[PDB]
Nucleic acid binder design. Structure first.
Length: 97
DNA sequence: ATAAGTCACATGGTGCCGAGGCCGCTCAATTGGTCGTAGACAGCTCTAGCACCGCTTAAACGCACGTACGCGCTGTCCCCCGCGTTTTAATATTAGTGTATTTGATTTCCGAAAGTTAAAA
């Protein structure tokens, strides 16, 4: 059952209490973002714990925006989200757009 | 027979070994006490409120009604994905070095405090 399996999947990671992005990717991503933001001479270290908190804030915001963008698609009487759709959802939420 | 003497006996006491029983030192923050000052107050006066009428006619609400407008309608285009598959790169392990932090001893730093006075509607 495609719908049954995928909806069950929503519910199980919906009630899962934990972060879910790939980790070594996320860590190297923040590392290179700091490296490019930082310059020639001053370089910055990262422990486990900062990377932690960064991750949780990113997860929480993107999931919140995710229900909102899903909802703007729902308001379009559809179930795909698009560029314009979410672009807007976020931008209506205001920050960073 | 008995003062000397040997002797064993009996009790003394001196020495060392735990050990359970008091003790000693320190720092928490309480509370005890005490200055000095925010706090509530002591006559108070007047502010902008908020009625309290007493008008007017500018909004406004309904009376009419009308295109605009919506809202499902409807062929159909399309696109998302449910997988199925190969990839594919995400694991998550050791690692020592290379500062990163880091915590002592100062060691200057500097502005709150105490005069002294500049300035100030």
């Amino acid at each position: 059952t495609p719908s049954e399996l995928a909806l069950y999947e929503i519910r199980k990671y919906q009630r899962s209490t934990d972060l879910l992005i790939s980790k070594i990717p996320f860590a190297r991503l923040v590392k290179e973002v700091t490296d490019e933001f930082t310059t020639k001479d001053q370089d910055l270290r990262w422990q486990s714990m900062a990377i932690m908190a960064l991750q949780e804030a990113s997860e929480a915001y993107l999931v919140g925006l995710l229900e909102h963008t899903n909802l703007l698609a729902l308001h379009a009487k559809r179930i795909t989200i698009m560029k314009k759709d979410m672009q807007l959802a976020r931008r209506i939420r205001g920050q960073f757009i």
